[PDB]
Design a protein around this ligand. Structure first.
Ligand SMILES: CCCCCCCCCCCCO[C@@H]1O[C@H](CO)[C@@H](O[C@H]2O[C@H](CO)[C@@H](O)[C@H](O)[C@H]2O)[C@H](O)[C@H]1O
Ligand SMILES: CCCCCCCCCCCCO[C@@H]1O[C@H](CO)[C@@H](O[C@H]2O[C@H](CO)[C@@H](O)[C@H](O)[C@H]2O)[C@H](O)[C@H]1O
Ligand SMILES: CCCCCCCCCCCCO[C@@H]1O[C@H](CO)[C@@H](O[C@H]2O[C@H](CO)[C@@H](O)[C@H](O)[C@H]2O)[C@H](O)[C@H]1O
Lengths: 1033, 156, 96
């Protein structure tokens, strides 16, 4: 095959060209996003029951739905939280590889069927079913600076004007509003309602009567009286359109002739759907747009289009409206592309310099300069063939493979140059010989390298998907590179390369290069002599070798494992959590402080702080909060003291001085999902109808008994909220009936006034918005206010709630969890310093067994995935080993010889482990993918030394030692070059600061150390390896 | 209403016996009330923490202290069925005929939830069996409506 | 039922259509609202698109719209299906 294309460089050129064309094409039609889809498919059902308590929600809504979630395919688990704000979410999480569309429709088809089983006011609100994706492309903030707009005013504007266009914009898949559109608000006054003998109920009846859509019919409708000349539509009462109208709604005609209007017993205004959440942006009112990339789209294009669309909107904004951009993955992703085109260009340059240095030839300088892009090009195509996206992971998968791509070019060319310079052959007859010397090993190398990477594609769940990105990118790059080196370069050499006449090692040459040529030709002898001496005394090194293997082993263990390394992402959060019973006022007092810190004590680094009151990662509620802090460009924040992780602990410290709050800050994780390695996710489960009190108790016990092992379990905590005082009001049925007061009148009056009530819809300026009846706040704050509400009894007499109710304080839950159907309590924690998670888990498991009867437990989330999908790392790598051996055995026609090559592996690992452990880094994914490529190259380098050596023996009839010296001599140069080019190649990443740094550091610093050692050690240890194995057998 | 006051509130409702002891040594408030007027005595009574109740009562805690809705710790104890806590409170001075804002006595609540042992004890400490809520019901009434035959016998 | 074209659009067609964006391979989207009270929204997909998957995706987005629609429109049911527009044939039935 290389001899085929040696006589046919046109064909090769065609193949080359075809590869580039597909590649260039595929570079265009290929999607761009930060990370690909990693988390397995999840679907969330969400509803809201206006004015409901956590139990009411759970018991009328959550249970009924959970109870109907059957017959759905590929479920793994189902979790739900029902809280004090009226909202339930239910999250069904499916197997990896489930079609999310299918999973979503199945879930919704079941919800549909369960719908008539839910309360009126809930089917009325509806229950939305969506895919779970915690990946925003960006977040558009919309604020008002001249204070003429409440956050409601802004939200409505955003909805009415901006939202739909952003929706329609190219590449945007979903758009979410950080507020609600307007709502017609009727703010009842119980004092007025009493002087006119009116309950909330009449107010609701009136509204449904006068804000309605009445069908009429037609004039001249079919069947007609013939001779009818006209057919028209009869158009009757339609929906109300204004506050003026709603206020003119008629409630009562007093006997004296007076009129009672809705505005006579209410204040009426355009308001919000709900008032649970207060959004502020640097202290000013705020709303927003949470925007998500669409499938197969391009983050960059889409982001650009989103901005260009907002631009077109600017001319029409009211006063003091402004767009700002507090979250944008796009400048980030830009940085990642730039840095990887750079690295792929830098490396061609490094290879050019090296190629020219040693080989001193321009016509040869070109061969790798063509081959490498051609391979990188066609790689893109095959990536598109399986439809991957240009993303953080596949891009780094390229830089990691760049070493092997470079190598195959360097190798093939250099060996032709050597064959001439040693035998005085013509370029054509030389390459035929040179290719003949390495071709089989190359096929062999491609197999051996396959068996190193391909297994990694087979890991399961979230992590597996990540490895799979690297695994596939690197196997294709490799295989093209081998194909290219068997088809293109052979031809390119044979037809591009300047002749060399026998013996001419350029020792008799000019200045730098003559000196280099002699300093190198000499150092080749020192090396030769060194190996000869090393071979005279092999025992010394089998001992040395066993020490590196121990060092490797010891180093490995004492290296912390992580998933993906933290990153100054331009933003970070901070959580606030006031205690039970705290008003939203008070929460804003804290939040304004937190905002104050970041704007004062970090004027330098903080551009904005988006404060959200009422929402929190543990729950919803008037006593919770979160602040999104946006930083100035990395170019304006230099030096570790100004990066996220610094500002974090500094802000966490200052906030520990906050009197009655729980306030800290934290950085987001890389990929928004997988949480913590060493970290676990635990579900305590009520398997026998024990109830809340008993479950809180079993929880308490499990927590307390976990706190008594700080050597395994650390930071073991409840995920949910704690019970809080509730106001229990008891209706006296007897006295209600006896006074002539209805239960339903009583209850509707209570709930409408105190909780609100969705009456119907109306039309505001062409858009359909909701109508809400509730008490004006000053009549629904305190318990004394309850008896200020009057309900009309059948006899027409006005009766105060004080006369048929009783009230007491009692504790209940403001958030109630469930897991696979049963009540539950979620428990978080991590493995203590230096322990594994399966250890910390095993203890939790052990500790849980001693819990009260009826209490069970399950592992969810990352812990679920671990408990089923980490065990493969040995088994998969055992397959590797076996195939690797098998291939090598096929290659060398020897059950024995393969050991000589396989032994090379730790020589690569030890430097990497040294280099990581040095810097203070981790055994994370990039590190591990870097290990494999380090190991790959060294395995390759070895494969060639062995093959040449063996070749000399079998063919030229040389001795063992004679061939190992000669081989190792021949193979010295191309190993120095490749390394030289690669170590430099990765250097930029090694030292990088900020802006996608943490990642580059990980891939780089573990490739560098590993390459250092695998080069130094292998040029001495591999010759030893061959000899001892050939001796033993 | 203080750093330790609130701290004590936390400790009593969760029943961290030791942390209470320390706070007690430190002079933490025994009249620290939350937003609903519950003192650490109420908290310990509602949640059934006998050691704490005994401890707090030694440290001058108010046993007839009362929430914003008129309810003393004895109520919470009687209602939620902690015999031992009821006895202690009573022995330590508790008002057995205390009426919350609805006119509901601790007898009433024990009656409704049918904790008869608590009823006898309250009866033994001289609870007015004839006392009636805002709706005018006796604990006997509560009993016949709930259909507790055994309980109604006692209340005669 | 009984609602005019402008009503049927403002309260239904709009609401649905504005939830209808971000679906795989969606070329264009025509719709209309008559005076009987009838909405018809048609999404056309790139040639090659799996028709059944297309339907499912539209089904899914329509869910988000359902509750926002008027009570009485949900009472009628709202269908989602692969569609045509051309009559293959017209079978006539008469009485001799
Ligand atoms: C070009 C040549 C290179 C090809 C290399 C790729 C081939 C890799 C094969 C894919 C393996 C799939 O992964 C599959 O996972 C399950 C895990 O429940 C394994 O099953 C495992 O069960 C228990 C788990 O407690 C293990 O201890 C056990 O060692 C193993 O048998 C299977 O043995 C494996 O087949
Ligand atoms: C690649 C970049 C870095 C370059 C340099 C880095 C440091 C490593 C240097 C190479 C080490 C090997 O160096 C080599 O060791 C052996 C010993 O085992 C020596 O060999 C000598 O010592 C041993 C015993 O002590 C004798 O059996 C042997 O007959 C004798 O000649 C060689 O004279 C020396 O050249
Ligand atoms: C010539 C043949 C080549 C074969 C040589 C073998 C390759 C060695 C380097 C790659 C290591 C692969 O990855 C290995 O398993 C898991 C992968 O999630 C890693 O990290 C961790 O993952 C899982 C799940 O998150 C944890 O349960 C586990 O505690 C831990 O092992 C380890 O850090 C690493 O030891």
């Amino acid at each position: 095959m290389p001899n085929f294309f040696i006589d046919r460089p046109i064909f090769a050129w065609v193949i080359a060209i075809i590869i580039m064309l597909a590649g260039g094409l595929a570079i265009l039609k290929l999607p761009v996003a930060q990370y690909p889809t990693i988390a397995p498919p999840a679907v969330t059902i969400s509803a809201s029951y206006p004015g409901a308590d956590a139990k009411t929600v759970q018991d009328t809504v959550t249970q009924v739905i959970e109870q109907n979630m059957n017959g759905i395919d590929n479920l793994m688990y189902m979790s739900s939280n029902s809280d004090s704000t009226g909202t339930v979410q239910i999250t069904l999480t499916f197997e990896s590889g489930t079609d999310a569309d299918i999973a979503q429709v199945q879930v919704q088809n079941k919800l549909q069927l369960a719908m008539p089983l839910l309360p009126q006011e809930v089917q009325q609100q509806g229950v939305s079913v969506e895919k779970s994706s915690s990946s925003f492309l960006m977040v558009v903030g919309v604020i008002n600076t001249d204070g003429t707009m409440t956050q409601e005013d802004i939200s409505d504007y955003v909805a009415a004007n901006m939202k739909d266009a952003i929706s329609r914009t190219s590449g945007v898949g979903d758009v979410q509003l950080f507020g609600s559109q307007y709502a017609m608000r009727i703010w009842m006054n119980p004092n007025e309602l009493n002087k006119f003998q009116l309950t909330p109920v009449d107010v609701i009846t009136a509204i449904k009567a006068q804000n309605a859509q009445v069908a009429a019919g037609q004039l001249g409708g079919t069947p007609p009286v013939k001779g009818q000349q006209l057919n028209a539509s009869i158009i009757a009462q339609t929906r109300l359109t204004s506050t003026e109208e709603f206020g003119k709604i008629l409630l009562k005609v007093n006997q004296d002739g007076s009129r009672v209007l809705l505005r006579d017993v209410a204040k009426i205004e355009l308001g919000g759907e709900n008032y649970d959440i207060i959004a502020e942006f640097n202290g000013q009112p705020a709303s927003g747009l949470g925007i998500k990339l669409a499938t197969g789209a391009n983050a960059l294009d889409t982001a650009a289009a989103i901005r260009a669309e907002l631009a077109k909107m600017e001319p029409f904004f009211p006063s003091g409206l402004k767009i700002v951009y507090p979250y944008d993955t796009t400048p980030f992703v830009k940085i990642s592309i730039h840095e990887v085109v750079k690295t792929l260009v830098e490396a061609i340059i490094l290879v050019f310099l090296v190629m020219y240095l040693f080989l001193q030839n321009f016509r040869a300088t070109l061969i790798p300069t063509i081959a490498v892009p051609v391979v990188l090009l066609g790689t893109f195509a095959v990536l598109a063939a399986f439809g991957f996206s240009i993303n953080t992971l596949t891009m780094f998968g390229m830089v990691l493979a760049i070493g092997l791509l470079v190598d195959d070019a360097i190798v093939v060319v250099e060996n032709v140059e050597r064959v001439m310079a040693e035998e005085g052959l013509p370029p054509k007859e030389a390459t035929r010989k040179s290719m003949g010397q390495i071709q089989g090993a190359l096929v062999g190398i491609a197999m051996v390298l396959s068996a190193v990477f391909v297994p990694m594609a087979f890991f399961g769940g979230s992590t597996g998907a990540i490895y799979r990105q690297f695994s596939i990118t690197i196997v294709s790059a490799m295989a093209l590179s081998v194909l290219v080196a068997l088809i293109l370069t052979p031809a390119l050499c044979a037809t591009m390369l300047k002749p060399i006449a026998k013996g001419d090692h350029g020792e008799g040459k000019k200045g730098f290069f003559g000196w280099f040529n002699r300093m190198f030709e000499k150092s080749t002898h020192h090396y030769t002599d060194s190996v000869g001496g090393i071979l005279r005394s092999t025992g010394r090194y089998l001992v040395l070798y066993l020490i590196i293997v121990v060092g490797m082993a010891y180093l490995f263990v004492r290296l912390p494992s992580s998933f993906l390394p933290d990153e100054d992402q331009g933003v970070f959060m901070t959580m606030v959590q006031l205690p039970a019973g705290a008003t939203q006022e008070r929460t804003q007092k804290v939040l304004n402080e937190v905002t104050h810190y970041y704007l004062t004590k970090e004027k330098n680094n903080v551009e904005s702080v988006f404060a959200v009151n009422g929402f929190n990662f543990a729950g919803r509620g008037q006593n919770t909060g979160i602040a999104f802090v946006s930083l100035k460009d990395w170019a304006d924040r230099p030096g570790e003291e100004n990066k996220v992780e610094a500002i974090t602990m500094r802000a966490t410290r200052a906030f520990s001085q906050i009197k009655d709050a729980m306030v800290f800050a934290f950085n987001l994780p890389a990929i928004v999902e997988l949480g913590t390695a060493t970290g676990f996710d635990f579900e305590l489960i009520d398997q026998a109808g024990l109830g809340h009190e008993k479950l809180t108790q079993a929880r308490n016990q499990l927590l307390a008994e976990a706190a008594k092992h700080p050597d395994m379990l650390t930071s073991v905590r409840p995920n949910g909220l704690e019970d809080t005082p509730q106001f229990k009001i008891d209706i006296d049925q007897e006295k209600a009936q006896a006074l002539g007061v209805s239960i339903n009148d009583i209850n509707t009056t209570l709930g409408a006034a105190w909780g609100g009530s969705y009456v119907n819809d109306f039309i505001d300026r062409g858009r359909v918005k909701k109508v809400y009846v509730m008490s004006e706040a000053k009549y629904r704050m305190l318990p004394d206010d309850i008896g200020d509400w009057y309900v009309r009894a059948a006899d027409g007499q006005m009766v105060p709630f004080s006369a048929f109710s009783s009230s007491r304080w009692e504790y209940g839950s403001p958030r109630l969890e469930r897991y696979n159907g049963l009540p539950s309590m979620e428990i978080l924690g991590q493995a203590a310093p230096g322990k594994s998670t399966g250890e910390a888990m095993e203890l939790m498991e052990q500790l849980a067994s001693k819990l009260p009867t009826g209490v069970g437990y399950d592992w969810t989330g990352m812990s679920y995935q671990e408990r089923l999908s980490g065990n493969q790392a040995p088994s998969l790598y055992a397959i590797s080993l076996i195939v690797v051996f098998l291939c090598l055995a096929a290659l060398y026609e020897s059950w024995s010889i393969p050991f000589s090559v396989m032994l090379v592996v730790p020589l690569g690992v030890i430097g990497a482990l040294l280099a990581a452990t040095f810097r203070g880094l981790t055994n994370d994914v990039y590190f591990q993918v870097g290990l494999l490529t380090t190991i790959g190259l060294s395995a390759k380098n070895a494969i060639l030394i062995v093959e040449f050596a063996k070749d000399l023996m079998d063919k030229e009839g040389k001795g063992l030692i004679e061939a190992t010296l000669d081989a190792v001599r021949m193979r010295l140069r191309p190993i120095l070059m490749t390394s030289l080019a690669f170590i430099l190649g990765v250097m930029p990443l090694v030292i990088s600061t900020g802006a996608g740094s943490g990642a580059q550091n990980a891939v780089g610093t573990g490739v560098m150390g590993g390459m250092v050692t695998a080069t130094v050690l292998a040029i001495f240890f591999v010759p030893v390896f061959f000899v001892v194995v050939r001796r033993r057998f | 209403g203080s750093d330790l006051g609130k701290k004590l509130l936390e400790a009593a409702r969760a029943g961290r016996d030791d942390e209470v002891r320390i706070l007690m040594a430190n002079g933490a408030d025994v009249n620290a009330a939350d937003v609903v007027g519950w003192t650490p005595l109420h908290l310990a009574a509602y949640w059934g923490h006998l050691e704490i109740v005994e401890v707090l009562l030694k440290n001058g805690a108010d046993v007839n202290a009362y929430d914003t809705l008129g309810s003393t710790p004895l109520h919470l104890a009687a209602h939620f069925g902690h015999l031992e806590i009821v006895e202690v409170l009573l022995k330590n001075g508790a008002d057995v005929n205390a009426k919350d804002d609805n006119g509901i006595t601790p007898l009433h609540l024990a009656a409704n939830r049918g904790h008869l042992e608590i009823v006898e004890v309250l009866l033994k400490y001289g609870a007015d069996v004839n006392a009636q809520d805002k709706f005018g019901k006796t604990a006997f009434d509560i009993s016949i409506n709930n259909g507790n035959e055994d309980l109604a016998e006692i209340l005669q």
